[PDB]
Amino acid sequence: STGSATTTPIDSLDDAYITPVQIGTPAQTLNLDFDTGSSDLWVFSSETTASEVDGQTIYTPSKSTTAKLLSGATWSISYGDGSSSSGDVYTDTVSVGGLTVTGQAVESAKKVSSSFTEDSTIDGLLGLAFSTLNTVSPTQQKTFFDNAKASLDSPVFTADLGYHAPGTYNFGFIDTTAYTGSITYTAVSTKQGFWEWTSTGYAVGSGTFKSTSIDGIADTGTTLLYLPATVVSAYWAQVSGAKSSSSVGGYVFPCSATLPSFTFGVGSARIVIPGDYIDFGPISTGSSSCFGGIQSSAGIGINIFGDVALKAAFVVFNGATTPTLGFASK
């Protein structure tokens, strides 16, 4: 089997991407944030505290003939941005782009933190990291990809995120028309539950490439590119007037600037992020200070190849017995 679904930016900045997902019988379509940095499929629901729902579409298990309470199971998750959610668990039929999994754990939110409530465009998350990170207790549950894998033509999914435009998540096949050149594959460590890999270095603009190992995670659920402070300083030093602002929470730059590109290495190959992809617009409405799309990871504990990096590439998440990642230009 295979599946193919379009993913769409939630706003003009590509702050996140939503993909329609069919849950239950008859289908209830919710727009979920596919997140290769986590491993829970959770949704706004008829159980979510009413004051914490503000425009989201909800899953109502009582209206699904295939929903079953997973008795005794609870979940609770906290994300790197400080947001969180928790609740109970149903199993139900879940389909993405024509690919159907029966018996998928659908984690129903009873509580969500303010950032989720305040984002009316995201109805939940669909985790695509390794199932060892799934938070369901006392019986840990499998991701949608893990459940689908055996049925797929090939045990892979691909992320093809757009810049200010829709893109595609494919399951079970590699669309050879969706990228240019060849795909360069690189080793993955699953020791932390992430799609963790080692970039071979970077360049800023037209500058020379610096060969240096940068361990980090391919994370579709993080907006920006978070890299070591040395790398980030070398980038922003090429932008007149750019500075790190403690009050704003990162590097800012004059909105009048033209930003240089940023290149990262994948083995001997190179992925180029155009400068425009690094512009996240005014820090507040009407400001002439703009927020940068490359930020320091120094306070995180891990480097994160988020959407800013991934949307410059066609990315293969290879879930074979030994997982690997593939990157191609496009």
Side-chain angles (χ1 to χ4, degrees), residues 12-62 64-67 69-109 112-141 143-148 150-190 192-242 244-298:
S12 64
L13 298 179
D14 297 347
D15 281 316
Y17 297 78
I18 48 172
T19 308
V21 177
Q22 281 72 49
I23 309 177
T25 308
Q28 300 178 40
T29 299
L30 274 64
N31 297 327
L32 305 189
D33 183 352
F34 282 23
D35 181 13
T36 63
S38 70
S39 307
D40 288 49
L41 193 176
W42 74 259
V43 298
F44 279 78
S45 75
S46 57
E47 301 182 329
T48 309
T49 297
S51 65
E52 299 180 349
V53 184
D54 184 10
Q56 295 80 11
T57 293
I58 62 165
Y59 170 57
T60 303
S62 65
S64 174
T65 62
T66 42
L69 180 73
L70 185 62
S71 181
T74 60
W75 64 279
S76 181
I77 192 160
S78 307
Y79 297 100
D81 66 353
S83 68
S84 62
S85 52
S86 62
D88 56 19
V89 188
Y90 294 82
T91 57
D92 210 339
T93 302
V94 172
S95 299
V96 175
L99 170 64
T100 299
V101 166
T102 59
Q104 175 65 43
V106 177
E107 303 173 33
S108 167
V112 305
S113 67
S114 55
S115 61
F116 288 116
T117 299
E118 290 162 3
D119 183 3
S120 63
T121 73
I122 291 175
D123 302 324
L125 267 63
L126 190 148
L128 293 167
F130 293 87
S131 293
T132 54
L133 295 177
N134 176 265
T135 77
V136 176
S137 180
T139 307
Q140 189 172 61
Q141 301 294 304
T143 70
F144 175 82
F145 178 53
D146 218 328
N147 281 324
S151 302
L152 293 178
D153 291 356
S154 183
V156 306
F157 69 90
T158 65
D160 180 8
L161 302 178
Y163 168 65
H164 295 352
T168 305
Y169 282 102
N170 290 330
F171 292 83
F173 72 105
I174 288 165
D175 180 354
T176 61
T177 75
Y179 58 89
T180 64
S182 54
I183 305 176
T184 297
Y185 289 87
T186 196
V188 163
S189 173
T190 66
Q192 295 190 91
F194 300 122
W195 293 92
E196 189 173 359
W197 66 290
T198 303
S199 173
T200 49
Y202 69 98
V204 176
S206 59
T208 61
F209 186 86
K210 175 72 168 182
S211 290
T212 183
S213 294
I214 305 170
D215 180 287
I217 66 166
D219 184 2
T220 58
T222 290
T223 311
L224 307 184
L225 173 54
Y226 294 89
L227 291 173
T230 48
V231 179
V232 176
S233 182
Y235 178 81
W236 290 108
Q238 297 304 311
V239 179
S240 291
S244 182
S245 167
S246 59
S247 61
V248 174
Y251 280 89
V252 297
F253 68 94
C255 293
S256 60
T258 300
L259 297 177
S261 63
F262 184 88
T263 301
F264 63 95
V266 182
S268 53
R270 305 290 179 251
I271 299 295
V272 180
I273 306 170
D276 286 356
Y277 291 25
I278 298 160
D279 179 5
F280 278 75
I283 61 170
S284 295
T285 303
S287 179
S288 73
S289 293
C290 273
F291 197 68
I294 296 176
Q295 297 294 344
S296 178
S297 65

